[PDB]
Amino acid sequence: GMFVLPFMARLGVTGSWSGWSITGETGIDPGFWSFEGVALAHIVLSGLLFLAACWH
Amino acid sequence: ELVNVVDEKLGTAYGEKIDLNNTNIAAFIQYRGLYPTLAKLIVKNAPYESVEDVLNIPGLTERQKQILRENLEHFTVTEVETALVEGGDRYNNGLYK
Amino acid sequence: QTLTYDDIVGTGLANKCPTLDDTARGAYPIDSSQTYRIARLCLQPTTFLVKEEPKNKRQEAEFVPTKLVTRETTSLDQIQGELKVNSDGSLTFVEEDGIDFQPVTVQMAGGERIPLLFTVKNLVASTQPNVTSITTSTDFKGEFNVPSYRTANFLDPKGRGLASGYDSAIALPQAKEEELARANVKRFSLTKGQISLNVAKVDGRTGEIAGTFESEQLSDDDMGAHEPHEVKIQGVFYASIEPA
Amino acid sequence: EINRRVQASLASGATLEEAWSAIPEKLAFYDYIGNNPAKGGLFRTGPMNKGDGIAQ
Amino acid sequence: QGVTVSFYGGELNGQTFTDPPTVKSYARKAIFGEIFEFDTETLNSDGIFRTSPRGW
Amino acid sequence: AELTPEVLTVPLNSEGKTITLTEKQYLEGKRLFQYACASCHVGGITKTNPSLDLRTETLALATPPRDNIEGLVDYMKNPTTYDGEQEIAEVHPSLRSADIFPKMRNLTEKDLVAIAGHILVEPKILGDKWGGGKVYY
Numbered sequence: 194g195m196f197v198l199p200f201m202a203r204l205g206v207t208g209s210w211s212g213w214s215i216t217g218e219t220g221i222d223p224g225f226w227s228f229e230g231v232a233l234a235h236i237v238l239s240g241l242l243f244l245a246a247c248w249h
Numbered sequence: 250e251l252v253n254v255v256d257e258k259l260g261t262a263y264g265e266k267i268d269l270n271n272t273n274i275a276a277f278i279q280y281r282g283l284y285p286t287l288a289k290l291i292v293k294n295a296p297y298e299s300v301e302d303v304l305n306i307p308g309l310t311e312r313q314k315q316i317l318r319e320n321l322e323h324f325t326v327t328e329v330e331t332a333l334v335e336g337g338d339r340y341n342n343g344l345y346k
Numbered sequence: 347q348t349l350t351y352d353d354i355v356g357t358g359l360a361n362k363c364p365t366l367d368d369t370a371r372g373a374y375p376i377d378s379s380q381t382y383r384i385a386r387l388c389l390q391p392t393t394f395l396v397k398e399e400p401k402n403k404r405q406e407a408e409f410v411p412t413k414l415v416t417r418e419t420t421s422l423d424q425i426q427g428e429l430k431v432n433s434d435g436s437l438t439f440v441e442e443d444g445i446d447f448q449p450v451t452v453q454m455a456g457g458e459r460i461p462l463l464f465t466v467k468n469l470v471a472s473t474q475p476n477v478t479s480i481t482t483s484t485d486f487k488g489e490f491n492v493p494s495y496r497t498a499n500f501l502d503p504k505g506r507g508l509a510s511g512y513d514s515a516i517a518l519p520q521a522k523e524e525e526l527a528r529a530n531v532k533r534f535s536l537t538k539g540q541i542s543l544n545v546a547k548v549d550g551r552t553g554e555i556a557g558t559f560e561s562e563q564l565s566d567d568d569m570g571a572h573e574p575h576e577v578k579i580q581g582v583f584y585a586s587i588e589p590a
Numbered sequence: 591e592i593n594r595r596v597q598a599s600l601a602s603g604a605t606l607e608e609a610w611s612a613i614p615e616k617l618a619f620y621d622y623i624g625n626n627p628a629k630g631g632l633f634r635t636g637p638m639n640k641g642d643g644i645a646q
Numbered sequence: 647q648g649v650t651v652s653f654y655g656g657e658l659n660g661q662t663f664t665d666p667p668t669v670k671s672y673a674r675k676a677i678f679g680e681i682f683e684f685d686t687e688t689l690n691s692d693g694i695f696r697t698s699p700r701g702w
Numbered sequence: 703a704e705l706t707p708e709v710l711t712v713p714l715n716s717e718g719k720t721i722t723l724t725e726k727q728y729l730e731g732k733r734l735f736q737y738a739c740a741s742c743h744v745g746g747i748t749k750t751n752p753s754l755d756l757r758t759e760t761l762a763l764a765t766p767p768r769d770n771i772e773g774l775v776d777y778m779k780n781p782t783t784y785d786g787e788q789e790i791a792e793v794h795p796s797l798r799s800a801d802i803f804p805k806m807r808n809l810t811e812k813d814l815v816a817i818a819g820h821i822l823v824e825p826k827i828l829g830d831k832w833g834g835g836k837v838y839y
């Protein structure tokens with residue numbers, strides 16, 4: 194039932210900070226742009242847009 | 250099925266006598282003249298296939314063999330229970346006062 | 347050039363085995379008439395691998411590499427024993443005493459922690475026959491005992507244990523007991539592990555050998571509550587042969 | 591009252607099987623702490639049968 | 647101490663138990679008073695005592 | 703209840719002559735036990751070795767028996783392990799090691815009797831509390 198996970202995987206984001214990848218390979222490092230890092234980036238962006246909405 | 254082996258061993262002669270293959274060293278205090286010197290030798294040279302094998306420990310004085318002879322009626326031998334001898338537990342089983 | 351505790355403390359070198367220089371490609375004669383012993387066997391693990399369990403029965407169940415979470419607490423050191431010279435020319439290390447166990451926790455992808463008692467407790471390890479000199483082709487193959495990761499007094503978070511503790515789930519006073527039996531009955535495992543010490547450097551003068559090891563053993567089973575994993579430990583070793 | 595009835599039967603020549611088989615199940619059920627109204631919990635919700643089960 | 651349990655009346659009438667896990671398990675039930683057989687499956691009974699309507 | 707003569711009457715030797723201590727003797731013994739021994743033996747236990755307590759039945763099974771006044775006085779002069787096999791004065795306080803245990807220096811025979819009497823009277827007073835540890839607090 195994964196809906197947004199394939200959209201992340203389609204464009205390059207395949208690893209997790211917890212260590213796995215969607216192709217199932219072992220021991221690769223995703224850097225910041227893991228699935229969690231995408232999700233964190235969208236949350237931070239959501240908050241910054243909220244503040245800009247208040248200002249405007 | 251699954252059984253508590255420590256609870257089972259209390260159903261044997263371990264629950265009544267000092268077991269020379271299993272019982273913690275501090276239980277040798279219960280009788281005169283075993284602790285510490287003879288108690289140390291008994292635990293060091295365990296296991297035994299019979300109680301009378303305690304007299305075969307190398308280096309015993311004749312007084313030490315006589316003391317052991319007076320206390321064989323308080324000793325027993327069962328199979329070594331690995332849950333009782335591992336972790337150094339025959340020298341310190343985590344019990345104090 | 348010999349170091350002190352204040353040089354070593356807090357650097358991580360205390361968890362390291364001593365090394366022999368690259369020049370020490372020599373050979374150590376085993377006089378068959380004279381007895382030998384090991385003054386210090388050090389084992390420093392570098393790589394812990396855990397075998398996965400794919401739920402399929404078949405498939406490729408390979409050893410995956412893990413991340414150590416319990417820090418530089420891993421080496422076995424100060425191990426002593428008698429190095430016998432057998433009839434057929436082989437040398438058998440019988441392990442006597444030392445710091446021969448370390449609890450280690452590594453973590454797989456997904457966050458699963460794997461606790462293991464990394465050990466060589468009661469190691470009997472023998473070489474090949476007709477080895478009149480420990481050279482850089484010597485291989486100590488052998489086996490050891492892996493006792494339970496927790497000992498018998500250990501209490502679970504609900505106060506249940508083997509030699510101590512509750513024998514049931516007291517927070518569920520009227521629950522059915524047979525589904526809780528694997529948690530309520532604590533069981534002390536004792537398993538075997540295999541290790542191969544491969545010599546790479548020999549001090550012909552002093553009697554110091556060093557090399558690599560590979561060790562295979564089961565991890566912790568949580569006193570019988572779950573299945574242990576298969577662990578492969580790799581690393582370096584150091585042994586100093588004193589004649590006795 | 592359970593012990594009284596058992597001793598009245600045992601004084602009259604009933605065996606121990608016969609004396610205790612004469613105790614009604616309804617009377618033995620009251621002599622069980624899971625029917626005590628002081629064994630519950632503020633957020634242990636629902637019928638008493640949700641706790642120990644339905645007595646058979 | 648070689649502890650055994652015998653049941654009189656009820657379902658286990660005449661039966662005697664001597665294996666120490668089985669004897670201990672009925673002893674843990676005997677702290678609650680009279681021992682009853684429960685259906686824990688119909689209601690997904692959690693085994694944890696609840697109060698009565700007298701309590702509520 | 704009172705601290706009667708019968709409470710204060712303990713064995714003096716291994717044969718069976720008794721000594722009835724005075725209340726002044728028992729109270730002086732408690733003061734000197736607190737002064738010199740209770741840092742390890744508070745309540746009749748032994749903090750640095752909990753296997754060996756000061757209960758009367760335990761001192762009776764010691765070799766030589768320490769369940770009388772003279773046995774305890776000899777132990778305070780020349781302490782042994784529980785079988786009597788080693789002399790442990792170099793790690794246990796005694797008259798013969800008062801140079802390393804300086805609280806033992808100015809102990810008289812009257813002081814050693816008084817401490818020995820306190821060790822014998824106290825379980826007759828406290829019961830299983832003496833030598834029992836925290837379970838009986």
Ligand code: CLA
Nearest residue numbers: 631632633634635636637638640696697698699700701702
């Ligand atoms: C006098 C009131 C009363 C009592 C004693 C009972 C008693 C019972 N009810 Mg009944 N019931 C009642 C009224 C009552 N009912 C009302 C008014 C309704 C309509 C909502 C119901 C609907 C109902 C249903 C649908 C069911 C019951 C059931 C039951 C049984 C189980 C109770 C339970 O688990 O509660 C649990 C109680 C709590 C968890 C306590 C609630 C605590 C509140 C939430 C805290 C409030 C804090 C407050 C907000 C803080 C304020 C701070 C502020 C002032 C600053 C018990 C026999 C059950 C049953 O077994 O029936 C067969 C069941 O299924 N009741």
Ligand code: HEC
Nearest residue numbers: 738739742748750751754755760761764768782783784795
């Ligand atoms: C700790 C530092 C102690 C102080 C101070 C005193 N004692 Fe002690 N006592 C101590 C130990 C560790 C032991 C056990 C020694 C061994 O056998 O390994 C003891 C033993 C005794 C005994 C024998 C008890 C028995 O069961 O037979 C006695 C009678 C005794 N000690 C008395 C005693 C007195 C009177 C002290 C005050 C002067 C005293 N001890 C000091 C530890 C320590």
Ligand SMILES: CC1=C(/C=C/C(C)=C/C=C/C(C)=C/C=C/C=C(C)/C=C/C=C(C)/C=C/C2=C(C)CCCC2(C)C)C(C)(C)CCC1
Nearest residue numbers: 194195196236238239240241242243244245246247248249
């Ligand atoms: C229950 C359920 C579920 C879930 C759901 C969900 C999860 C939902 C959510 C949702 C959400 C979560 C939503 C939200 C929304 C929001 C909104 C709608 C908002 C709005 C806002 C606004 C209005 C703003 C305002 C402002 C401000 C604040 C400031 C500045 C300015 C302005 C004015 C703009 C499901 C389906 C699964 C199933 C069934 C059941």
Ligand SMILES: CC1=C(/C=C/C(C)=C/C=C/C(C)=C/C=C/C=C(C)/C=C/C=C(C)/C=C/C2=C(C)CCCC2(C)C)C(C)(C)CCC1
Nearest residue numbers: 226234235237238239240241242243244245246247248249
């Ligand atoms: C470059 C880059 C990138 C991108 C980024 C981005 C996308 C950014 C964004 C940014 C943003 C998006 C920003 C924002 C900001 C905002 C702000 C700055 C706001 C503020 C506000 C305010 C100040 C307001 C205030 C207020 C309030 C709050 C309330 C009321 C009142 C007032 C109005 C005063 C990436 C990652 C891709 C990659 C790398 C590179």
